[PDB]
């Protein structure tokens, strides 16, 4: 039950000029920039409201028409707050015309080699929320740093409570 994501190019934050063309399938993205500009980028995003708990990864069918390697990265947002980016060092899988290999996320990016024409596998455990360190397929329980009990004694001058045991149950 693969879920195909709608590719809309109405929302773009960039510092380049480009020509986007829809074809039978997918879309061609042409950019004109310079070697000097080391801040160059073309961020393309969408606004949604979907539940993705039944999926475990991104499958990006991309093709590079240049001999030089490209670079791409992902960013997901949950609860209009938590932003998830590629976890540095995490393994991603690139399947080309004849070879499939593992490459680690470097400087927050995925290297797309020259003439690459294939698909890219990025598991959701590869996207993380920096601040919380919570990976996209987990929850806040994944990184508990403190637990405590607040006690508000009765109007009696001296109160005593006995705590025999505290544990965490799981179905």
């Amino acid at each position: 039950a693969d879920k195909i994501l709608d590719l809309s190019f109405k929302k773009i934050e960039t510092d380049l000029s480009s020509k986007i063309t829809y074809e039978d399938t997918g879309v061609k993205i042409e950019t004109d920039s310079s070697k000097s500009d080391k801040e160059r980028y073309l961020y393309i995003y969408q606004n949604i409201k979907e539940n993705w708990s039944m999926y475990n990864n991104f499958y990006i069918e991309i093709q590079n028409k240049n001999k030089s390697s490209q670079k791409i990265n992902l960013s997901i947002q949950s609860k209009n707050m938590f932003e998830f980016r590629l976890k540095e060092g995490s393994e991603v899988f690139l399947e080309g015309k004849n070879i499939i290999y593992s490459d680690k996320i470097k400087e927050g990016c995925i290297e797309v080699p020259g003439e690459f024409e294939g698909k890219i596998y990025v598991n959701f455990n590869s996207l993380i929320n920096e601040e919380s360190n919570v990976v996209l397929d987990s929850n806040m329980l994944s990184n508990i740093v403190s637990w405590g009990i607040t006690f508000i004694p009765s109007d009696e001058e001296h109160n005593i409570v006995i705590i025999k045991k505290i544990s965490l149950l799981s179905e």
Copy 2:
């Protein structure tokens, strides 16, 4: 099941206390004044663990007084989010003579007099007030935005073709 280590640090507000660690649990003795309405004893332990595999908080406690006590929970995640009892949530207090489902009143749990049983609290009854995020809620549950950034090579004219972007179930 994971038996939490009963080792604490404490904050005292308008009261003094003693924490003795006996073989039959930890005894908490407080000395305070009926007039000091800001009385409050916070006992906690800082750690670095993963409780994803768990779903509930088991607390067996005994109240030595005839007057009710009030307890609250505070679980913190590295991002400095503190989760507390959700207002209107349900908690189960199983005593010897009385057993029932209880409600969170003013963010606290009423511990009846001479109570001597167990209190069950599900992690979905813990929430961060400002974010309004439940402690066991998965991130994938509510996705509001997703994006892809393209960083071109040094070549002046770059062309990348994206035929398809999907989510695979596993």
